[PDB]
Amino acid sequence: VDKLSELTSVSDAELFGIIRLIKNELLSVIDNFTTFGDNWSCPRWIDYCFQQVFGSDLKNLIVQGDFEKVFNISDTLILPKQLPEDILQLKPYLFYQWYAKRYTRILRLESLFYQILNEHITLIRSLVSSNNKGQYLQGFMNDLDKIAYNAQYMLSDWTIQLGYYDFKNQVTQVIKTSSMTSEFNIDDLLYDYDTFKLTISQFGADSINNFTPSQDLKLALNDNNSPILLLGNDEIKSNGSITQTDDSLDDETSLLLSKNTSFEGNFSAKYLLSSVGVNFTFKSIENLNFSVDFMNINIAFSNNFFEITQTGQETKKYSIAKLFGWNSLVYLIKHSSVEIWDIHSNILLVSHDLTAPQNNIVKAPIKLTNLDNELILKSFEVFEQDEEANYNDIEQGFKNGIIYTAKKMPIIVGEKYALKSSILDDMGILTSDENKKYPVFSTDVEVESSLNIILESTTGDKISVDAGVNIRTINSNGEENYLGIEDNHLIFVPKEEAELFYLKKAVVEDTIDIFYVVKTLGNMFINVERISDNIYRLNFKAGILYSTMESDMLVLPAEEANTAFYIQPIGLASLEVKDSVLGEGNPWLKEDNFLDATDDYGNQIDLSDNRISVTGSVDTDKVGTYSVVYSYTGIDKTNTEKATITVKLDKSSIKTQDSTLQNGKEWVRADNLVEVIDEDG
Amino acid sequence: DVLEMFDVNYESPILESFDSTTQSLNDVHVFMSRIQMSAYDADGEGRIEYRNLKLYEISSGIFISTDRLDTGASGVEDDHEMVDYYSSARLTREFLGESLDSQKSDYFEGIKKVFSFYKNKCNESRYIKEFFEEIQFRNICGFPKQAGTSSTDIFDQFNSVDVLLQDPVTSVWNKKVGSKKANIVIIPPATNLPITEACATAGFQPEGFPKLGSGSFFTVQFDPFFSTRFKAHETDDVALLDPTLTLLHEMTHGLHFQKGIANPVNRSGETPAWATTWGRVTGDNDAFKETPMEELLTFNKHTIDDDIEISDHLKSTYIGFLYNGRNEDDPTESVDGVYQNVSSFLNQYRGFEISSDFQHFIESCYGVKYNQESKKFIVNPRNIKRYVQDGFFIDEAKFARILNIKTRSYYTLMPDNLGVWSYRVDILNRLRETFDEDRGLLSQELDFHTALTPVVSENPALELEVAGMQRMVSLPKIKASYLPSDIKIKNFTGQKISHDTILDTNISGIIISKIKYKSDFVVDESMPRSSLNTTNYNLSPIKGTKFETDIRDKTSVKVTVSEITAPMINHVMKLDNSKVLTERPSLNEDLEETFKNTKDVYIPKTTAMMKLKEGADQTLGAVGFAVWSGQILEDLYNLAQKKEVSIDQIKDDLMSILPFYCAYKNLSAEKYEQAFANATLDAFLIFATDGGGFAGLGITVGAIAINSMYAKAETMEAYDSMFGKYVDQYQNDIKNFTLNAYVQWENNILSRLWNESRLAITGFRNMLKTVKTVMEFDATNQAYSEEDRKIIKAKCEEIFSEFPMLMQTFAKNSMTANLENASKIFNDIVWQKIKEELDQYVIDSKKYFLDSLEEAYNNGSISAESYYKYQTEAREKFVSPREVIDLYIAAHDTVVKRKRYIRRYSRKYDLATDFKGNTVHLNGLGEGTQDIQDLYGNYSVYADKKTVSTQEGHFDQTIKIAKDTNTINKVVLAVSSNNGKEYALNKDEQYTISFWLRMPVPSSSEERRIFSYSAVSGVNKEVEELILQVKNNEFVLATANLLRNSEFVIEPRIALNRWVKITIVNENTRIKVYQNDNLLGLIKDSSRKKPIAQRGTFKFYNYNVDYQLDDISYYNGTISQRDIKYTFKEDHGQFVYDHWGERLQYNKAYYLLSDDNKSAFETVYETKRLKLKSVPGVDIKYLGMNDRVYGYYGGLQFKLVPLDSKNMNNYVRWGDKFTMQSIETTNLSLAIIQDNAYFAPTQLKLISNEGKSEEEIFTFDRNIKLQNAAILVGTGNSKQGPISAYKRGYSGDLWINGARLDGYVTVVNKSNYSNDEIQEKFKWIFVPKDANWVE
């Protein structure tokens, strides 16, 4: 009221300010009644209408006894003068009798609130569309269409709730006030709510799609079988090679965007109160440089930095973690903010404040220019979402069934992985003991022989959670020992006495990582039990205490992270150095000629690690070349990288002396600076 | 192994001769010793003295004494009681009808029975075993080694107790013969302390300020024979504090004393501001309340009605500030921290060649490693972060969840005077069986324990008066009654970075993901537990006192406030009970006039109290009272519903308020809605004044300034140090700024609004005690008719029975409004101002870096290589931080942790719950034959192995229950929560039992029983409450614990081989039944007969068909229909299900049916075109009747082949693409093929799948996650790529409908018009050929 009174013009800003108040007026609900019914979801604007007419709201005048007074219901149900052979048969007869006698008198006051709801929304369509001309307006009228369609169903659903607890009350009163069936099972004459409600009205406010579908990117073929490319249902442009690849995160195909390859569609937010976005899955190989141009915002992913430019505003660079494998990203455009989400782990990545007003209602294009090596897209949906839709409450993972490594590539049968524990990370190395009968997690730094892991199923290559595996164990030399179980200990067995292990997806409390518990068919879960200061056993315990079976996952508490394992790849060890041409006297640290290193699992480590030794120094005073050996000493192999640092002789002096010029003495350089010599002199 | 107790009695002889050669000191167990105490004198001056005490080494490092050291007078007279019982006679004289020696013999046998209970709880939980180890067997190291202790000497005053013999020359026990390993000392409460006061103290506190990491053995002054009463979470159900938890609260305090992380202290000696929380009441003189964060971490109890708690990210901030210390701008207020005190202690051994037993003594003390070369301790700044983090791995709240014993802090004890606090606990079972060694106290109901009889009982109180008025409000003197103070804004300034500045390195900001698993404690049997080193100490009286935890403040502050605080509004809203009501309560609608009468009750000006101030009209009899009281109940529920408002401060969001909150600003609930137009964020505060002045929301954030560079040397190496260091402090300033911003939000906003959430639930509970007493006074109105009082008093007791659920509904809404307000103030005010300030910090520091780098290069103070190094460095480092995203992920992990707490909230809880609210996790943990075991350890499962099985099945595992056609009503599975203790019985108990049930069709009406819940009505007594059975040819949920005991016929056919979910919400009055997610009906209009507890048995009986069960659950309170629908959808997870309710499987023979007709495909006469034909129904007998149910075995069967074939038992999830292969002919698969020779031009056909075929890849519509059924979508691709629109007919997705002449396909509409109407999805059903279904 005070918004629509103190207004001579509706701004584009006040369009959003109004539609939130109409959504808070016509979609607001008072929840609880708790007598004459429990689920009584009455809209707020109708009880205000009953408050203005009768002084009290509708709960305070059903209690008074004015339900049949204010609904103009002037009739009660009656049994027939001859009841059937089965009093079960007057179960729907009282549903037809109550519909005619009493519900159509409720339904005729639903008619009046449907007319008052339509005449109010007609007025705010009149007060805004005549006082605001702007590109946002079609979003306001489209959203008033959505609030009207939803409030007309919320009004519809509320009379069924009023109807159900009136039908429930009239059927008790029709057989308590009769001697024919005075004592009888009234629950044989009543209906449950979802058979009463779906008999009257098949659809309610729960059946409304609040937003239009998500516009899947797809390859297709014409009637002339020409390779078109859809975005939902409408063909879009395509500029380069977009072909299919079996390289997927699951056993589906995937799209291969080649170098400098782009499609271009169109999109628009239908409503004002919506966030719009791009949901897409891709394999994050190195040197990816793609760029999505969505709703006049360019979001350029480049070398694990995010650049977001609004059209006509400053480019802002955003630093993320190194995205390692298959990533699900959502490029959300909100009001006044652009947000990038990881949907594997359900965390925020980038949040860029929009400095210009963002209009998502006009049609703006959707590009994806690839700009570097071949982007393996899996999905690409352009959706439109609720503005207060959280990505925090969703339980994390691909929700796929495939078991992934910590670097989010799927596990293939073979391929020599590495079991890591969650208690003790990458620094906790799986190995064999002195007797070569147990696998042991040793957190030493002098571990002799690491033990890699090979899972195998004789099924599909991407290993499912639903399939049991055998876990071979191969050391640095190639001794293959299958893992088995005796006396509740994980030991080494032959092939024929191996045991089916069932990897199950799990999470522990205060982390965002996806772990795996390893169980058997008998619910015996591998625990990492500590036996020495630096040595851990793998002993099976029956079930996980205080573990919650969620959807298919286990929610481990922080105290039961023994059972949480994860898997890393191997042979990803790297060390890259450069050759820096120094000068005589110019300083050198060991991190100057070091570019980038990487663990056996692919972790980007630096020179401050206790595995990279720099054997050699320089002088920077004598002219001679100096070779510095950088060396990463792994768990099994040590790779050394030569880095030579020349010290080129520099003799750089620009010796000067002072001068006094004469009467307007034309000036050149040569009268002052006297001795200038280069590096070699 | 762990609490392995020595053969030591009270009657065991003391050590009087040692001889030093024949016998070991490790075999001495009773001896005289010396413990450092905080003695007092006649002056009241404290001094830290040593006291002689006879010790008794009851276990391998644990000593107890029975002496009550003369530590000065109490100052409080004998047999008085402030809140703890003060006496001077206990363990000094004859006290309460027993001699000194009998008190001394009982205290030995009493403490040794408490530790007997802990040893029985050592083997039943790994989490208690890891505690008693970490606390008894630990190596303890203290830093500033005193006089008479050499370096490289493993036993000194920190971790040993002296063994004293008596002199020949005099009777004084001071002839030291050695000192053995000490971890714990349990003495009685001393002379200067009350009888019931448990207090933990570090054993040795040296002179000077305690260093963080300086460990000590801990002394506990604890008496297990006394307790104080507490008002439990169960409202006005008073209980007794369990003394076996009161010791575990102090050992938790004492584990911090062994690690050194218990008294964080700055350089000036005081506690830092980040280590306490301060309350405040301002007025004539200021009153404050300090609650240290070590107390908040020892009782880290996560409930709404407990102020003594911190979040997991605020805990980690305190854990990380103990580890790395915290430099302030004033360096006398900096904290040294653990890492910078262990590292300053282990560098004294850097060139000294310590021994092997001393090296292992430290390497297990601090997790460090020692190399034989270089003679030094390599200290690791991750094993010390792991050292401080593992000091707080457990707390009194986690002990009370393992041990099902109820608790409340001494720091939140409200004197609601039900009488006397101090009770006598009988731990030796002298009068009745009170305390076992297997189970603890067999009750906490204070009718067991004998109450003490004091002479004077003066509760301490905060006396608040309004300035110009006259009414004293004696609040409790606890943290709840004070305004929680804002944390001081930091205001980060410049650094002036040089090449030699030792800037911090181990600073971690907000940590998002951390495994907080306390690493297991390795034992070392090859380490000495004593030393035969007579070295005299300095036992001179140090002037001061020792830091004692859990000291109870017993003063009373009088403050004359200016403004009425919410705690006071809460107070005067209470009926002021204690009287018998002669006149009506003088209900007063004005707050500033209630403080003028000292007899009025402040009622808010709502339409619930204005109908209570004006009574019922007595002219109308029972009917007018039912309308009056009934309307008041409805008008109180209107105050409980959260309603959204709008603020100009919060863009794009509607903030929430409860109508009740007007009570705290004395508004009419419609003038209160007026005040949110033209408003600020300093509204939404019900508690916005400390008593003197306005105290608004501290949303202001300190400004962060860029650092300077000042080179003191002009070398090229000095600038490469300075240009490197400037980026290093740039990252350090951001990591401290985003961490200071989390603690400003989590304290000033989230903790302030959560405290105003619980000040509202208190005040709403207080005004509901005014509704009760006025409706009860009006029910005893003599003007009413005497047979109308039978109807009127029954109505007052019926509106009262709805207070339970009203106050749950109010608490779930007051929490949800104030949590979403604190969530929205973060997203819109705090995190926006962090992002706005750090954007100017990133930009100005980059501008400052790249104007000194180009200045130093052009001048020539840096090389060309170094200029190119730090230009690529500024491009990669001076960028938008990921710590403002880590600040987001921190603040939205605390909110999710509290959005989950509100979802599982119960007014009354008994068992340790889940995060879903469940208290049961039956699992089938068996090698070959599965024995069912509860995984939460709350329940005890009896499973008759002849019939109860456990299979793979529904979601993970089912409990199959076999037939018994011979003997009816035999319990075969019984999941009990009944220990045999005495619980708080109430009629006002709600719960929610819930289980999935798959039962085939039962042909017989044998009038058996399926299932019976039976709640605990006493001590090893149980009344049946909810019986599901076959009663008259229909399943009936009967009822056995109501005053009238109605039944409820399950009309929907639940036994048709399909997985149903039966939820029974048993409130007091109503019992709602749910099938899956729809309310089948109620049992109302009757209350509970016998009072019950929230413990009980889940007796599942034998039936005459093999039925199954799954997710048998029990919730401590009611579950909404909203929350039953949400639980039901999330129970199904990400799978697509059969009709039977079992997950779909690839390579499985599925009858594909239509879900509306149940009509199935069929080939046209000879061709491969499909025609949907109807599947005939089944004439069954269901419980002896003649039901006619849906038939499912008709027509064509279809596998779902995946895209590259694996094997059968893989499950189908939402988003899994497959290929429907015919089974009757294996070489044919479903495809959608355009023919243009039929009426339907784009029919659904069976095409050949041999070789490179273009069979259609199908899927299910992911965006419609149905249960029991799904919508097929022809994806439009094949295994050879996308299908040609010439061959197919269309190009994209096709829904598969039941319409020929459309060709059973319609286009999936994704245009901007598809949600203008209702979608009309066509559901399909997959029935596999099941063996419990015949047609």
Curated annotation (Swiss-Prot), chain B:
Cofactor dependency: Zn(2+)
Protein residues bound to Zn(2+): 249, 253, 295
Taxonomy of the source species: Bacteria, Bacillati, Bacillota, Bacilli, Lactobacillales
Annotated InterPro entries: ConA-like_dom_sf (IPR013320), Kunitz_inhibitor_STI-like_sf (IPR011065)
Species of origin: Weissella oryzae (strain DSM 25784 / JCM 18191 / LMG 30913 / SG25)
Keywords: Hydrolase, Metal-binding, Metalloprotease, Protease, Zinc
Broad EC category: hydrolase
Protein's name in the database: Putative botulinum-like toxin Wo
Cited function: When overexpressed the N-terminus (residues 1-476) cleaves rat synaptobrevin-2/VAMP2 between '89-Trp-|-Trp-90' in vitro. This releases the cytoplasmic domain of VAMP2 from the synaptic vesicle membrane, which would prevent the assembly of the trans-SNARE complex on the membrane and thus prevent vesicle-target membrane fusion and neurotransmitter release.
Notes on activation and inhibition: Inhibited by EDTA and 1,10-phenanthroline.
Family under the similarity heading: Belongs to the peptidase M27 family.
